[PDB]
Amino acid sequence: LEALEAMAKDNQPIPPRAMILSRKYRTLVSSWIEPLQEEAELGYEIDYIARYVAEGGLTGDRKRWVPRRGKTPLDPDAEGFIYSNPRETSFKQRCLEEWRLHHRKLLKTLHNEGPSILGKISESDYI
Amino acid sequence: DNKLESPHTTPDAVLVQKLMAKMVHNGTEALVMEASSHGLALGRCDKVDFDIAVFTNLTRDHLDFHGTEEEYRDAKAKLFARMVDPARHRKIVNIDDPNAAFFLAQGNPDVPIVTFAMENKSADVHPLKFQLSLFETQVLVNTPQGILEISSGLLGRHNIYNILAAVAVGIAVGAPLEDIVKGIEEVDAVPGRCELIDEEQAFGVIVDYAHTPDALSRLLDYVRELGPRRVITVFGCAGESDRGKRPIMAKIATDKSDVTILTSDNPKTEDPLDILDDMLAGVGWSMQDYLKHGENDYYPPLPNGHRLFLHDIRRVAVRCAVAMGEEGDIVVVAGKGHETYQIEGDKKEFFDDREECREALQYVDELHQAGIDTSEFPWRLPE
Numbered sequence: 001l002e003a004l005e006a007m008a009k010d011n012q013p014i015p016p017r018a019m020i021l022s023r024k025y026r027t028l029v030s031s032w033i034e035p036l037q038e039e040a041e042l043g044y045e046i047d048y049i050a051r052y053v054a055e056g057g058l059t060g061d062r063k064r065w066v067p068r069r070g071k072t073p074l075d076p077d078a079e080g081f082i083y084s085n086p087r088e089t090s091f092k093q094r095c096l097e098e099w100r101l102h103h104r105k106l107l108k109t110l111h112n113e114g115p116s117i118l119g120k121i122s123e124s125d126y127i
Numbered sequence: 128d129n130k131l132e133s134p135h136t137t138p139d140a141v142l143v144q145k146l147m148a149k150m151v152h153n154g155t156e157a158l159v160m161e162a163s164s165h166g167l168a169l170g171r172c173d174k175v176d177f178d179i180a181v182f183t184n185l186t187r188d189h190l191d192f193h194g195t196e197e198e199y200r201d202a203k204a205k206l207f208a209r210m211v212d213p214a215r216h217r218k219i220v221n222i223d224d225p226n227a228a229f230f231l232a233q234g235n236p237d238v239p240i241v242t243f244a245m246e247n248k249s250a251d252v253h254p255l256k257f258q259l260s261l262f263e264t265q266v267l268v269n270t271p272q273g274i275l276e277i278s279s280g281l282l283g284r285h286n287i288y289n290i291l292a293a294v295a296v297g298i299a300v301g302a303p304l305e306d307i308v309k310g311i312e313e314v315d316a317v318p319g320r321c322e323l324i325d326e327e328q329a330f331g332v333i334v335d336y337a338h339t340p341d342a343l344s345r346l347l348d349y350v351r352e353l354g355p356r357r358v359i360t361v362f363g364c365a366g367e368s369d370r371g372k373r374p375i376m377a378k379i380a381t382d383k384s385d386v387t388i389l390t391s392d393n394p395k396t397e398d399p400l401d402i403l404d405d406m407l408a409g410v411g412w413s414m415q416d417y418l419k420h421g422e423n424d425y426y427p428p429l430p431n432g433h434r435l436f437l438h439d440i441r442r443v444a445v446r447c448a449v450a451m452g453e454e455g456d457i458v459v460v461a462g463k464g465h466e467t468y469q470i471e472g473d474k475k476e477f478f479d480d481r482e483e484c485r486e487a488l489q490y491v492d493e494l495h496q497a498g499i500d501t502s503e504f505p506w507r508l509p510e
Contacts, residue, residue, distance in 0.1 A: 022413055048411050049374045058370040064404040065413035074415065 019077050022065060024051060032091045137166030140174045164188035164199035173202060176210035179217040179299075183292050185226035200230040208234035215239075219295035221288065222247045239299075241272065243291045252291055259283060261324055261331055261353050261457075263315055268294060274304035278314035281323050283352050290314060319465040321346070322481065324457075329488040331457035332449055334481050336464025337362060340376045343461055347383040356455035360384045361448045362462045363441065364402055366395025373402065374409030381410050381435055384459075386451070388436045388504075390444035392462035394471040399439045410435060424505050436504040441469065441479065449487035450494060451501040460484065 007014070020026050023039045039046065055062045067074055078085045089097075110117070119125055131146065147158035162172035168189055180203060188199040207216055216238035220227035223244055231240055242250035252273050254266040263279035266287065273294045280286020293314070297307045317323035322334040333350070337343040343362065350358055360380050364373050380387045389406055391399035404414040410429065417437050420426055428434045438444040441462070448458050462479075463469075469479045491501075500507040 022416075046411065048409050049378065052374045052405075052408055053371065057374075060370070062405070062408075064401060064408075065415045066400050066404045067415055067418065 021077070031088075034090055034092060036088060036090055137162050137169060137171040140171050143171065144175070164203075165192070167206065168193055168199045168202045173206040173209075175206075177207055178212070178215055179296065180204075180207035181217045181219045181292070181296065182227055182230060183220070183289060185220055185224040185230060187226075197226050197229060200226045201233070204230040204233040207238075211235040211238055213237040217241065217296060217299055219243050219292055221292075222250060241295055243288070243295055245287070245291060252294075254287065259353070261333075266290070270294075272298055274298050274307045276304055276307060276311065278307075278311035280314065281317070281321060282349055285349075286314075321464060325481070325485050325488060327485060327488050329491075330452035330454065332452075332460070332484055332488065333457070334460045334464050334484070336466070337461035338365075340372055340379055343376055344379045344383075346459065346461065347380065350457060350459055351383055354455075354457050356453055356457070357385045358383065359386045359388065359448050359451060359456065359458040361388045361390060361444055361458070361460050363390050363392030364406060365393045366391075366397030366402060368395070370402075370405055373406045377406045377409040381429055381433055382431070385433045386436065387433070388438060388444050388448050390438050390441045392441060393469065396472055399471075403437055403439070407435075407437065426504060434503070438504075442483065445484055446487045447501065447504065449484050450491045452491075 018027055021031070021037070023037065025039045052062070063076065065074060073079065073084070075085065115122060115126060143160060147160065151158045160172050160175045160177070165188070166172055182200065182203065185200050187196050190196055190198075193199065211234060213235075214237065216235075218231040218238060218240040220231065220242065221244050222228065222242040223246070243252055244250045245253050250270075252268060252270045254277070255269050256266040256277075258265045261281070264281070264283070264286065265279050266277040268275060268277045268291070273291070274297060277287075277294065278290035280290050290311075293310060294307065297310050298304075300306070320336065324331040324333055331354075335342075335346050337346050347358070347360065360383075362376070362380070364370075364376070377387075377389065380389075389403060391402060394402075400414055407413060407417060412435070414437075426434065426436065438447070445460060448460070452458055467477050467480045469476045494501070498509050
């Protein structure tokens with residue numbers, strides 16, 4: 001969001017690399033929600049044939065998701081990175097991970113700083 | 128009785144006339160020239176005096192080629208009116224089709240007219256029997272002009288309509304119904320189109336030429352009508368064919384059939400896995416998923432409750448489909464009904480045939496005794 005605000009301030013449009021995944025729901029807006037790599041429920045059923053003709057139907061121009069032997073990423077989002085796209089992690093998972101890391105570094109500081117702390121109740125509070 | 132090899136569906140008119148004359152000179156008493164709607168509109172059967180010109184099913188034919196509806200029917204009516212005799216031409220056709228009545232209205236009115244419709248009361252033809260089965264469907268036709276006994280057809284309505292249309296031509300020559308026994312036997316002889324199940328003691332295995340989505344859905348509905356239990360289908364698209372057909376067909380098969388095995392019927396210079404991915408795109412899956420699901424033993428079933436399976440070799444796919452069967456379950460091969468040529472790239476092989484499917488039914492007993500399980504595509508083997 002900060003980067004999007006900076007782009008809006010500098011009048012920079014979004015690059016055309018808003019790549020959709022195998023599920024057309026994926027975008028930079030909502031690929032970070034709890035249901036990952038899964039499409040939400042909608043009133044109308046998903047028309048895979050419609051999508052087929054939309055990407056290009058029988059015009060011989062579609063991305064066919066088939067693994068190949070060569071060292072080439074079949075996923076188009078991996079393009080541009082030296083090794084691979086960053087691993088897919090949800091916002092809740094990132095929040096809980098940073099919370100665990102903050103508490104872990106707090107415990108590390110308590111360990112390598114000795115029992116002496118601002119708190120005056122030592123015996124029960126330490127345990 | 129013999130038929131000469133011809134590349135096109137309708138050969139040249141002059142060559143056909145020369146062959147008919149050579150046959151009538153010695154070895155044949157009659158030379159009947161029968162052509163389809165496209166052949167009649169092209170001019171193959173038009174340049175020949177037709178004694179009887181009847182239509183089995185009148186509908187929109189050659190609409191994209193001729194550019195106008197009812198063009199083939201009008202051409203057939205004009206060809207019949209060019210050479211017509213009193214009480215000699217037969218107009219036996221389904222009364223439900225308006226094109227049939229439009230074609231019967233044109234031409235000489237002195238020609239005999241009749242209808243082969245079952246529901247229509249004016250035609251006086253009706254099945255009046257309930258003996259439909261995959262092996263034989265005998266009906267007791269009760270008509271004044273038509274014969275009493277009917278022919279055993281494999282299809283429910285199409286074969287019944289064909290038998291009803293042929294009963295008129297059979298009774299026109301001879302009023303006695305005993306002469307129609309040979310015709311009924313030849314109709315029940317399991318001809319090329321939509322071949323019947325094998326005569327071996329086993330579950331139903333049928334070979335159909337479902338090269339189009341509409342024909343595939345029609346054959347699946349016909350098999351669902353008769354099919355008491357799980358229906359298994361195996362078919363493939365054609366390399367370099369319209370790929371528009373590919374997504375829909377897979378969905379149409381997965382809808383009706385509980386177990387669908389997709390394999391490349393004709394690679395035709397296209398990767399087998401490359402077209403199978405486009406086929407699975409219709410149901411929402413990709414080759415990467417299938418394979419990952421495949422790595423897992425699970426192969427999760429379609430959300431509708433049906434199981435989809437994918438393989439790249441047609442022979443092993445047909446063998447697994449013919450080995451996975453139940454007492455009431457039926458397997459339907461929809462790749463090549465009246466064709467035995469398989470071309471992968473430049474190479475062409477003729478190994479594909481119904482005998483390959485019959486060998487599977489014959490040898491499934493060895494795999495059953497050994498302990499192999501064919502209920503699912505991941506086969507359980509001892510240890």
